[PDB]
Write an enzyme that holds these catalytic residues in place. Sequence first.
Site, PDB file in Angstrom:
ATOM      1  N   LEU A 166      -7.071  -1.053   2.441  1.00 28.41           N
ATOM      2  CA  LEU A 166      -7.293   0.334   2.841  1.00 28.41           C
ATOM      3  C   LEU A 166      -6.786   1.380   1.851  1.00 28.41           C
ATOM      4  O   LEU A 166      -5.850   1.130   1.078  1.00 28.41           O
ATOM      5  CB  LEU A 166      -6.647   0.587   4.200  1.00 28.41           C
TER       6      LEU A 166
ATOM      7  N   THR B 164      -4.142  -3.924  -4.088  1.00 28.73           N
ATOM      8  CA  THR B 164      -5.322  -3.364  -4.680  1.00 28.73           C
ATOM      9  C   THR B 164      -4.881  -2.112  -5.428  1.00 28.73           C
ATOM     10  O   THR B 164      -3.963  -1.423  -4.993  1.00 28.73           O
ATOM     11  CB  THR B 164      -6.282  -2.981  -3.559  1.00 28.73           C
TER      12      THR B 164
ATOM     13  N   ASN C  85       0.827  -1.195   0.000  1.00 27.72           N
ATOM     14  CA  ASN C  85       0.000   0.000   0.000  1.00 27.72           C
ATOM     15  C   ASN C  85       0.866   1.251   0.000  1.00 27.72           C
ATOM     16  O   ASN C  85       2.069   1.177   0.243  1.00 27.72           O
ATOM     17  CB  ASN C  85      -0.924  -0.015   1.228  1.00 27.72           C
ATOM     18  N   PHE C  86       0.247   2.390  -0.295  1.00 24.07           N
ATOM     19  CA  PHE C  86       0.934   3.686  -0.288  1.00 24.07           C
ATOM     20  C   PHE C  86       2.183   3.755  -1.182  1.00 24.07           C
ATOM     21  O   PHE C  86       3.194   4.341  -0.792  1.00 24.07           O
ATOM     22  CB  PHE C  86       1.273   4.113   1.154  1.00 24.07           C
ATOM     23  N   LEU C  87       2.110   3.148  -2.363  1.00 24.98           N
ATOM     24  CA  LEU C  87       3.097   3.392  -3.391  1.00 24.98           C
ATOM     25  C   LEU C  87       2.876   4.838  -3.766  1.00 24.98           C
ATOM     26  O   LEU C  87       1.785   5.199  -4.213  1.00 24.98           O
ATOM     27  CB  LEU C  87       2.875   2.479  -4.612  1.00 24.98           C
TER      28      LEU C  87
END
Length: 387
Positions: A387, A149, A113-115
């Site tokens: 998320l 995601t 997440n948070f790429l």
Amino acid sequence: GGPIKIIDPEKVSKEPDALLEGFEWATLDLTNETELQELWDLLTYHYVEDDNAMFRFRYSQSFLHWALMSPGWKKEWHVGVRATKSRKLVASICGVPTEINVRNQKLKVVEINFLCIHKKLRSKRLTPVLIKEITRRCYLNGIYQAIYTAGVVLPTPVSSCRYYHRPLDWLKLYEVGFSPLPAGSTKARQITKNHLPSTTSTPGLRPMEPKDIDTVHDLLQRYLSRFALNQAFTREEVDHWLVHKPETVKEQVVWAYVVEDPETHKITDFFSFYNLESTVIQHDNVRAAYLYYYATETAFTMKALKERLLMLMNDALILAKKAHFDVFNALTLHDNPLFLEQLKFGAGDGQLHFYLYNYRTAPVPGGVNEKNLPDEKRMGGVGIVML
Ligand SMILES: CCCCCCCCCCCCCC(=O)SCCNC(=O)CCNC(=O)[C@H](O)C(C)(C)COP(=O)(O)OP(=O)(O)OC[C@H]1O[C@@H](n2cnc3c(N)ncnc32)[C@H](O)[C@@H]1OP(=O)(O)O
Ligand SMILES: Cc1nn(C)c(C)c1NS(=O)(=O)c1c(Cl)cc(-c2ccnc(N3CCNCC3)c2)cc1Cl
């Protein structure tokens, strides 16, 4: 289904690859307030926008703490890139560990997440570099699969789910250009359409408490077992992801509610939602609540499921409105297609595509049909919320 390749522990490089001249790798320590601020500074101005450049996700520092220091977390999986001279944080990519079920095979994975890459460094092919480095740091810790995601389509998605949106404060949404005034109508009419009761209706509904952990853990696991792809929750994971600690979290991010049967006093249902604002690129903030995990005993018997979900989710809407959220967002996953239309969620333009790294499995249904509309016969696939 199964792993695509076996990673040779022996050949995992102890040193990262080279970076663009002027930049260097930096592990982030999110227990340091200044570094947490740095990551917030990056995401706030450079993270996910809509196609019209009207909105940008605005994860809070409390949200980042919660999302990235979940059970089993390691700072080694919080990867940053800094400018060598100024020390400025200019890229990030993060993972946290969890276990998932893929068609009844349990897998140890990292959720990615948070790429994020600073606008000024876009289109330099840094992304594959970030992905390769976090992959290397994961391989070094004995993790060889991932789930993630994404809003864009990449190679071999495992599923696709559509975003839906239930207006809570229609006027605010209209005001910021999120919701339009359809055509022959009026504000008064849109407000009427979206109006919600003042109180919840489900008997025994209350905020989840620490005492509820064991029984919510068991109900959730049974419920999620009904999906081909799901998250294999541990007890610590229920504590962390589901029960807000007011004493230690001043800015609440997760709301969870249980239904405690009037007679047995057993919990028979629960639902939860989390707080994720968007900055209005130009009011200045949309306060969105996102539906998270839920479970109901009714699942295990039908069609009482639809009826029960209609009750719980309308209550979830009431509770979110009461907590001053502007909109309530949900995807077509879990059993959501059973209630989205009838509770007046409007179809969104957003699509979330799900991916597995180094694991092959057949596509799983994402709650929609070939027309990208909710389908009750297309459920049972996706039982994991990222998320
Ligand atoms: C075992 C453990 C494994 C762990 C790792 C598992 C893999 C996890 C994978 C990561 C999961 C992330 C989950 C999330 O956080 S999804 C959130 C992604 N972040 C954003 O949308 C924030 C706004 N955008 C940006 O910050 C940049 O535009 C990003 C960083 C997205 C791309 O930067 P930029 O625009 O400057 O591009 P480039 O020149 O560096 O690189 C171009 C290449 O990047 C491929 N690309 C583009 N977008 C994505 C994307 N969202 N997932 C995976 N790959 C992506 C693209 O197809 C192209 O490859 P292709 O062949 O042409 O070359
Ligand atoms: C209000 C607003 N603010 N922003 C920033 C946007 C895009 C909207 N409009 S939206 O609400 O209708 C909406 C929403 Cl919520 C989400 C996505 C979406 C698409 C793909 N991927 C992701 N993620 C990346 C990985 N982590 C999970 C989230 C989000 C798109 C839309 Cl368009």
